[PDB]
Design a protein around this ligand. Structure first.
Ligand code: NI
Ligand code: NI
Lengths: 121, 118
């Protein structure tokens, strides 16, 4: 009844999509949501509309959209909210609700990661 | 003698630089490096060359550059390595260019928090 949709920037190089695919695989391993999907804003498929439509098709009535972005920017304030129909400019049903979440940000766990990377781990 | 340089994409909006500033401040609180600096690839100052120069001027001989990017892309494979002189097109100082964030189990943890509004 609820879906997690991870959305990323998307690049000409495949690394951005590969990242979202691995993250989605890890989320699915946690057994938290019946439905998990990825969408890329640009350059790659699935697109964000395709991901949300796929979640709706599988029976989700609550669509939790998480922007896999480090910081806010024009894509998280404008482009993605527009694709989701949350701001003026994908048909979302009446009984479906989009829950648009916050990006990663300066999380203490990002600091942990950065220190590992700094030491080659 | 060693510096941590965090580099980010940089945006017209201030949020990208503000992120890097907050991360560097948190790193400095860990008391791991003598010298900590940020640089933005585009749109903002400090630029990446400016960040590395400040680290060198403060006495660093080992400059660890960490790309605060989620995934590899043209900026981490070409643009930033070029700005760092690691590819075609510094002193007895050594640049150590590290890997981006990637699909870390801790990113999964963060994402789950964000999914639930935490
Ligand atoms: Ni962009
Ligand atoms: Ni770019």
């Amino acid at each position: 009844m609820e879906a997690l949709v991870l959305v990323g920037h998307g690049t000409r190089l495949p690394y951005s999509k590969e990242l979202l695919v691995k993250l989605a695989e890890k989320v699915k391993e946690r057994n938290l949501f019946p439905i998990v999907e990825i969408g890329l804003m640009e350059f790659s498929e699935p697109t964000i509309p395709q991901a949300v439509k796929k979640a709706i098709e599988q029976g989700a009535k609550r669509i939790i959209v998480v922007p896999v972005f480090l910081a806010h920017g024009i894509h998280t304030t404008r482009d993605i909210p527009r694709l989701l129909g949350l701001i003026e400019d994908l048909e979302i049903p009446e009984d479906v609700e989009i829950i648009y979440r916050e990006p990663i940000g300066a999380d203490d766990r990002i600091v942990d990661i950065i220190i590992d990377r700094a030491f080659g781990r």
